Amino acid sequence: VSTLIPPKVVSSKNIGSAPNAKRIANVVHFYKSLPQGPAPAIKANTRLARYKAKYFDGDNASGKPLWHFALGIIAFGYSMEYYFH
Amino acid sequence: AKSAANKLDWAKVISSLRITGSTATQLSSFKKRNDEARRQLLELQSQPTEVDFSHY
């Protein structure tokens, strides 16, 4: 006798699958993400975004700003030594 | 013939694997196989209706 009609309705393998939850997530997350960004280091732009670019990028952990800032404090109280002299 | 029907039937059984809800769909298919096989033995059983009034 005639083969039954349950297989001709699908709406329980289309909404009844687990990656649907991931699908609706990653259509929003990925589709709505700019493939590229603006600029990594730019804070303090006044030729001191350049200071950030040379020293406070994630492209270096080089000791130069530390040295520079340290030397600043040496310059601060030392000048004041000759101001207090 | 039955063989077109049966290739599509058994192919559909192996498709029915890839879903669940074929609970009595396959049983309908088995019934279709049964009665199809019944007509084939029916056709083999037959003798021409009339007596062989030549010999008999």
Curated annotation (Swiss-Prot), chain A:
Question: What biological processes does GO assign it?
Answer: proton motive force-driven ATP synthesis; proton transmembrane transport
Output a single Gene Ontology CC term carried by this record. mitochondrial inner membrane
Question: Which domain of life does the UniProt lineage start with?
Answer: Eukaryota
Q: What is its main location?
A: mitochondrion
* Compartments, record wording: Mitochondrion; Mitochondrion inner membrane
Going by the UniProt record, its keywords in alphabetical order are: ATP synthesis, CF(0), Hydrogen ion transport, Ion transport, Membrane, Mitochondrion, Mitochondrion inner membrane, Transit peptide, Transport
Homology family: Belongs to the ATPase F chain family.
| Subunit | F-type ATPases have 2 components, CF(1) - the catalytic core - and CF(0) - the membrane proton channel. In yeast, the dimeric form of ATP synthase consists of 17 polypeptides: alpha, beta, gamma, delta, epsilon, 4 (B), 5 (OSCP), 6 (A), 8, 9 (C), d, E (Tim11), f, g, h, i/j and k.
Q: What does this protein do?
A: Mitochondrial membrane ATP synthase (F(1)F(0) ATP synthase or Complex V) produces ATP from ADP in the presence of a proton gradient across the membrane which is generated by electron transport complexes of the respiratory chain. F-type ATPases consist of two structural domains, F(1) - containing the extramembraneous catalytic core and F(0) - containing the membrane proton channel, linked together by a central stalk and a peripheral stalk. During catalysis, ATP synthesis in the catalytic domain of F(1) is coupled via a rotary mechanism of the central stalk subunits to proton translocation.
The note filed under miscellaneous reads: Present with 14600 molecules/cell in log phase SD medium.
Protein name, UniProt field: ATP synthase subunit f, mitochondrial
Q: What is the lineage of its organism?
A: Eukaryota, Fungi, Dikarya, Ascomycota, Saccharomycotina
Q: What is the covered span of the full protein?
A: 7 to 91 of 101
From Swiss-Prot, chain B:
This one is known as ATP synthase subunit d, mitochondrial
Other observations noted:
Present with 6820 molecules/cell in log phase SD medium.
Quaternary state and interactors: F-type ATPases have 2 components, CF(1) - the catalytic core - and CF(0) - the membrane proton channel. In yeast, the dimeric form of ATP synthase consists of 17 polypeptides: alpha, beta, gamma, delta, epsilon, 4 (B), 5 (OSCP), 6 (A), 8, 9 (C), d, E (Tim11), f, g, h, i/j and k.
Compartments in which it is found: Mitochondrion; Mitochondrion inner membrane
Q: Indicate the family of this protein.
A: Belongs to the ATPase d subunit family.
**Entry superkingdom:** Eukaryota
Q: What does this chain do?
A: Mitochondrial membrane ATP synthase (F(1)F(0) ATP synthase or Complex V) produces ATP from ADP in the presence of a proton gradient across the membrane which is generated by electron transport complexes of the respiratory chain. F-type ATPases consist of two structural domains, F(1) - containing the extramembraneous catalytic core, and F(0) - containing the membrane proton channel, linked together by a central stalk and a peripheral stalk. During catalysis, ATP synthesis in the catalytic domain of F(1) is coupled via a rotary mechanism of the central stalk subunits to proton translocation.
Q: Which organism is it from?
A: Saccharomyces cerevisiae (strain ATCC 204508 / S288c) (Baker's yeast)
Q: Which gene encodes it?
A: ATP7
Record-annotated membrane-spanning stretches: none
